């Protein structure tokens, strides 16, 4: 009584469910049982594909995390959706108009079988992060215990604090990330990014994610680090980003323009479950 597909984008594994050609119902309890890695399917998030709710768009989709609750993140699960509906032959388009808990959107499959995702334009206004500060600035001063840290703060819809470092392998993420996440000036906490700039077009990146700790790939994290890198004159307009679990290509042309994020999505297996 249900067919699903297990996928991952740069190590972010989804259960993906066609609710277009399938009648299908959920619980918070059920989703929890399914998400459990030894008792169920095992996933970080469940992605449900649904028919469009207006005659101009193509599909709509929802995301539930493994706690059971809906997730509204801007780029979350977009590339896995986008390769899925083509793989299961539900569309043959390369541009796909989609609606989520965040609004309309458009997704492009490239010749390489990667997905380009319009993330919107990054907001730097502190009150929108939220980030407690006197005026919007390109760089702020974090007084953290005995150290002094030069942060840059941006919102991709998430809150992010980006830190320049010299070698990401040499950074003390597991010690400093927690103290910077639960900082005073971050009432909603923040996503901590450690960014090593290699060239104007190539950086490396590690992210200590909110309430979770270090992840092998945060999409909005990469977007934040490249935004703040561009706003600080460090980076060119098309930056390759190296994350512990693979590569993203971010393009953004400054204020007034949206930010485009491009990555893989991997299809891993097809599965059938009762209940």
């Amino acid at each position: 009584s249900m067919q699903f597909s297990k996928m991952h984008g740069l190590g972010n594994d989804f259960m993906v469910v066609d609710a277009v050609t399938q009648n299908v119902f959920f619980s918070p309890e059920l989703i929890r049982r399914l998400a459990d890695r030894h008792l169920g399917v095992g996933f970080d998030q469940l992605l449900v594909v649904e028919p469009p709710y207006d005659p101009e768009l193509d599909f709509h989709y929802r995301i539930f995390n493994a706690d059971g609750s809906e997730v509204a993140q801007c780029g979350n699960g977009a590339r896995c959706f986008a390769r899925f509906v083509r793989l299961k032959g539900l569309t043959n388009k390369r541009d796909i108009r989609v609606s989520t808990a965040n609004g309309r959107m458009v997704l492009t499959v490239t010749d390489d079988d990667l997905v380009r995702v319009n993330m919107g334009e990054p907001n730097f206004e502190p009150s929108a992060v939220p980030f407690r500060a006197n005026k919007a600035e390109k760089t702020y001063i974090m007084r953290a215990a005995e150290q002094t840290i030069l942060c840059g703060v941006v919102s991709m819809g998430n809150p992010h604090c980006v830190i320049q470092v010299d070698d990401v392998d040499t950074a003390a993420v597991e010690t400093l990330g927690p103290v910077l996440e639960s900082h005073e000036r971050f009432p909603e906490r923040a996503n901590i990014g450690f960014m090593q700039v290699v060239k104007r077009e190539h950086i490396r990146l590690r992210v200590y994610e909110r309430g979770a700790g270090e992840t092998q790939a945060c999409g909005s994290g990469a977007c934040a680090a490249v935004a703040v890198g561009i706003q600080q004159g460090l980076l060119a307009e098309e930056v390759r980003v190296e994350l512990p679990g693979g590569r993203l290509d971010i393009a953004w042309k400054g204020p007034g323009h949206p930010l485009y994020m491009t990555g893989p999505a991997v299809h891993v297996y097809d599965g059938f479950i009762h209940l």
Partner: protein, 158 residues
């Protein structure tokens, strides 16, 4: 006209265009929408009655449309209880349908929303492919799912 299980025979029609959209019609009077579906008279062929309600409720002669596929079998749905008329016997419990998919090889202008003095539909518009599966009344919904599924591959040919 009913069979032994209560189902009465009907045909459904899904007109699409090269761009990959299908035609979505507003039911007469009301503002609820659905696909064209009509009753097969005694001694009618499936295809016969199809072209029948195609002309009556669309105004389309066989020169204007190109048949693309029908379903293999009959698809059944059951009316809910509150809409069942138990006293008029034999009692119709639901419908068994055969669906046909046409391509509009003519123009979006021979779409005569009301040819007869008995128009079952006010207006119409073009919609994306999987839009009806959401909008159609809930009890019709499984039928629409299976239909659009079987048709989807064929429609994904340019």
């Amino acid at each position: 006209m009913i069979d032994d299980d209560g189902y009465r025979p009907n045909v459904g029609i899904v007109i699409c265009n090269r761009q990959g959209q299908v035609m979505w019609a507003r039911r007469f009077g009301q503002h609820s929408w659905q696909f064209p579906q009509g009753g097969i008279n005694p001694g009618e062929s499936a295809e016969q009655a199809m072209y029948r309600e195609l002309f009556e409720e669309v105004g389309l002669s066989r020169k204007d449309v190109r048949i693309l596929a029908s379903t293999r079998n009959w698809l059944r749905y059951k009316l809910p209880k509150r809409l069942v008329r138990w006293d008029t016997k034999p009692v119709c419990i639901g419908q068994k349908q055969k669906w046909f998919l046409l391509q509009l090889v003519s123009g979006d202008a021979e779409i005569n929303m009301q040819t007869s003095s008995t128009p079952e539909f006010d207006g119409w518009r073009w919609v994306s492919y999987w839009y009806p599966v959401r909008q159609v009344v809930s009890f019709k919904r499984d039928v629409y799912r299976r239909v659009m599924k079987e048709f989807a591959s064929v429609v994904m040919s340019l």
